[PDB]
Amino acid sequence: MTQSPSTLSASVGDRVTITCRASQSINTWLAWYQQKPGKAPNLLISKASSLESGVPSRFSGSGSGTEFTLTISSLQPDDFATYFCQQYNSYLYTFGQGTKVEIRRTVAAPSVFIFPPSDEQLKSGTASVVCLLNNFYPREAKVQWKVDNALQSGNSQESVTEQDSKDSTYSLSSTLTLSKADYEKHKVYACEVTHQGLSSPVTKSFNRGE
Amino acid sequence: VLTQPPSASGTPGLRVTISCSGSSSNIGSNTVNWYQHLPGTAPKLLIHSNNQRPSGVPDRFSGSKSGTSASLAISGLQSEDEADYYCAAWDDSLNGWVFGGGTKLTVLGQPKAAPSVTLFPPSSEELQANKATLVCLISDFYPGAVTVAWKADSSPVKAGVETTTPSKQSNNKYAASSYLSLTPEQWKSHRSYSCQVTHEGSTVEKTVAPT
Amino acid sequence: QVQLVQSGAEVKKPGASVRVSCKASGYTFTSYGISWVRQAPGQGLEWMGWISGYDGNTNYAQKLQGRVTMTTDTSTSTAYMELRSLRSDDTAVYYCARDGPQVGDFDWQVYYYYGMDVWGQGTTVTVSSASTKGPSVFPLAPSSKSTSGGTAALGCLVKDYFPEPVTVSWLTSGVHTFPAVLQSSGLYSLSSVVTVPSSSLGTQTYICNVNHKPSNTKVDKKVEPKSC
Amino acid sequence: HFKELSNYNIANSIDILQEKEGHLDFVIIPHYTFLDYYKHLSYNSIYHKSSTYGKCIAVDAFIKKINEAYDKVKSKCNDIKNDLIATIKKLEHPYNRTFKKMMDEYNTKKKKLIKCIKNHENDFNKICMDMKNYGTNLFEQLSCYNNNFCNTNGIRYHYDEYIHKLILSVKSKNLNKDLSDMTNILQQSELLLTNLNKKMGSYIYIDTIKFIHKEMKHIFNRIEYHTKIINDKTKIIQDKIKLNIWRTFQKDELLKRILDMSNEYSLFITSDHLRQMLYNTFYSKEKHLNNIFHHLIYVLQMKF
Amino acid sequence: EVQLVQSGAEVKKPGSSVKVSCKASGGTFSNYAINWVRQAPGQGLEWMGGIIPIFATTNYAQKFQGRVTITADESTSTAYMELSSLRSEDTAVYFCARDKHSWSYAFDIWGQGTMVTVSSASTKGPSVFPLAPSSKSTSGGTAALGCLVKDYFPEPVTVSWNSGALTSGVHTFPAVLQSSGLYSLSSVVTVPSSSLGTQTYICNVNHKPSNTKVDKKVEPKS
């Protein structure tokens, strides 16, 4: 239940090694599973390094106590998924939280756009302001909201796409939701974005009604 | 070769357990089986494996094993459980089957009934035939287990004693009998002879003497 | 053709119970076990419990103790799992998998040096009080605030629907449809965006197609440019 | 203890079996008995001690999983196998083209299947090694109550539940009568082909009938060989089982005895299994001979 | 299914030999063993040996090994146990039983048993003696009287009173081999003392092996 790389950035052809530490000592029991989006997990390895049949010759196991590893000798384009280790000593199984492997590229910077609420939505008594971060890498980033220069807390939401099949970038949406009355009580609306592809934070803003 | 209690007793509806003690070479390494036996009938298999019983054996019978010992538990005791019970196991050192000693189970129905004892001396007819038999007749005791002793005025003696196995009577109590063979000279040489029947630790005595 | 087949998606109210089936095929059900494991949205896996198809002996996780029951039908080769007194945090994807016949066994379960080799397709179970509601589709108009150079961004806001899922189509290159987020109302919301050349805004038409089968809602929304 | 089954260069010891109508399957004879030898080792081991009996369900679970894994490797050649089935389908049922094109087609599809099996041998070898490791691990850990007085009731149980019923089954069908009849059928087809061949025209079927007759003798020669091994192993097995049943042995002798018995059973079982499957294919092809003969008599009095 | 059935009872002299049979009624000596177990009076079950018919392999309990030979019949479906140099301690019931491999070779089917009695010789023994009424409970007004059946051979005997017409208060005691080597038993009737004045009592004793019937009247002592 101890995964070394929470989120691992790698390259096609690279040798990838993921270690699964434990709590106490398991004699030799540790399963390795692979999981792709929308699909069920698939058993890569059992016991020490007995990769079940149909598992390619690249996946290799290890360990015999509290420190095991899973080694992919050369990462293939179909291997970018998340990896699980199971530790079966006692009657109760333990499923260590998964390790996500995704392809690393040159540091990108997000394109930031902001959308005020449509009058159609202001018909319905609610106001949502949408801040879009498009085509960025890595996934390490931050977004914060300001309303009339006051930092906002507990009224926004963040959703992230997984990697793109062409340029392997991520995209993110941050939506701030107020009531129509609260929205009309204020003027300036801004989202601030920080990312490694940006030397200085990017702020996108507008005035209500303008 | 396996040690069981020679007898056991239980109250209807309760639970009774019968122990069986063995060694590393039999129970320590092989399975133990249990059989029920009512004389006049073939023994019956009760348990064929450790904690297992064939179809037709009620769920009141349970077996267990721990190390070199095993135990049979009978719950909800019923009158049809009165019988002899034998454990058995394969013995690796002997390369054969060994059995436990038979625990006789007395289902308690009638109360603690003391034996009635009648003692007859030798007849004149037998004495004229140069023999002397004393007859000790034992009836109406319950439970069905006694021990018989034939004392001498100042010293003991047993040479020449033959005693029957116990039999259930018509009134659902039990009977037994014991014969002491003497020469006429021995019979005539003592002031009296006594038959003593011990049952559940309590003793009943009768005495006879020459005429 | 060794496989495990699970029942379809379920939607339940808090306090109710759910029953999920896992029908084995292409193998001797009585000689293998079945384990149940759940996966909360965008989270790791949690083992729930296991039952032997031979022995019928069970092993439940302490957390789920008293609320979950697993049963088996050796005649139809089917394993069942029932979770009662459902709670919001039980919303997850439930899986069954082939395993040992004696997991929580006595000494060494070593006669099985493998584990979970075959998995069911999974069953989504949603736990929420209220009933369904179709989405509100609002335009995300392209403007100077969403234009930089020759690239303009635009999209549609698909707000306040229940339950999942919705589908959005537009034009496929540059499209990004974000995963839904859970709001404090208990309703879902998402946006679908696309980047296009800013020179096209005057002559090209952009329409988003939103489908929500649970409520039988279909919406085709035209997205027009906005001035400042 | 010099283990009995072990890996070597087994190039071509494959068996092809058309059991029912176009039901092609094969068996790599050495892997079949290697696997069954360790199957017997595994069971004798768990049955040896009174306590370990209960893992009979876990062992069956492990072996069946290894079979599923082994069958996955065979299933990776099903396309070439179906490619051969259709070619046999063309040969056996000629209802133009000639026996030259057809016979050379059949030999190429057959060699292609065998080449597919050769390319996957390392994948088969890994599964077999996994079975050897599991079984020998359970055998190595075989302990006794008293090392100088090991009980042989493990062998008695194993034989009584895993091999007796067969030895009786085998003596029940009178193996060698089943070959005297097979020869009778082959003789009869030699005579009825000659006694029927009086002209030309109706020819395509004379060629295919000969072909089926040949393949039927090939199958026969196998059945002949296997029944020979079954006959001598049934005797050896009974002879030996008499000596390792009612007594004790020192650990070393007990282990050596288990390996010897397991070798005997593994062989007996292997060639019994094949003997039946080939019996199946011999009659499948016999039933098809009745159809082709009957069709030949139509164009007999068509050409007159 | 299979059905075992011993074949007969016996009576032999010390030093002779006896052969007991056990016949399978299903008709097929399966791969199961048929075992022999005896029980002497007051000794419990004792395993003697077994044979596996279809393989003709035998096993013997050590303490019996030089005296017992077990054999079998593949055609007539019957096993045999032979015991030579019979001793008095060999008087016992002899059982055959089939073991069951799936039930850890427990004995699940049993024959009905064969009694073997080992004794000295054979005679008659016309000693029947009246046992005159004596007081048993004086408060209760009850007396005991009987017949002594002395010096007979072999078993069994039956005792009746007044040619079957007297059943209340009758109790017949088991026989035992006396130091003379002969059996004796006694039959006692409990009666009311008030009837002793004029109620007739005649014990009827039958010894079939010697074709001896003896009647003996039991009257108050005179």
Author numbering:
A (entry chain D): 4 to 213
B (entry chain C): 3 to 213
C (entry chain E): 1 to 170, 175 to 232
D (entry chain A): 148 to 242, 297 to 505
E (entry chain B): 1 to 222
Paper text:
The Plasmodium falciparum reticulocyte-binding protein homolog 5 (PfRH5) is the leading target for next-generation vaccines against the disease-causing blood-stage of malaria. A fundamental and non-redundant event in this process is the binding of P. falciparum reticulocyte-binding protein homolog 5 (PfRH5) on the merozoite to its host RBC receptor basigin (BSG) (Crosnier et al., 2011). Here, we examine a panel of human monoclonal antibodies (mAbs) to PfRH5, isolated from the first clinical trial of a PfRH5-based vaccine (Payne et al., 2017), to define critical mAb epitopes in atomic detail. We identified a subset of mAbs with neutralizing activity that bind to three distinct sites and another subset of mAbs that are non-functional, or even antagonistic to neutralizing antibodies.
The binding modes of R5.016 and R5.004, the two most potent known human anti-PfRH5 nAbs, were next determined by X-ray crystallography. A crystal containing PfRH5ΔNL, one R5.016 Fab fragment, and one R5.004 Fab fragment diffracted to a resolution of 4.0 Å. The R5.004 and R5.016 binding sites were corroborated in solution by hydrogen-deuterium exchange mass spectrometry (HDX-MS). R5.004 binds PfRH5 toward the tip of the “kite-like” structure, contacting the N terminus of helix 4 and each of the three loops that link the converging helices at this apex of PfRH5. These interactions are mediated by five of the CDR loops of the antibody, with only L2 not participating. R5.016 binds predominantly to the N terminus of helix 2 of PfRH5. The major contact is mediated by the H3 loop, which lies along the groove between helices 2 and 3. Additional interactions are mediated by the H1, H2, and L2 loops. In comparison to previously studied murine mAbs, R5.016 shares much of its binding site with 9AD4, while R5.004 binds to a distinct epitope which shows some overlap with that of QA1 (Wright et al., 2014). The most likely explanation for the efficacy of R5.016 is the proximity of its binding site on PfRH5 to the BSG binding site.
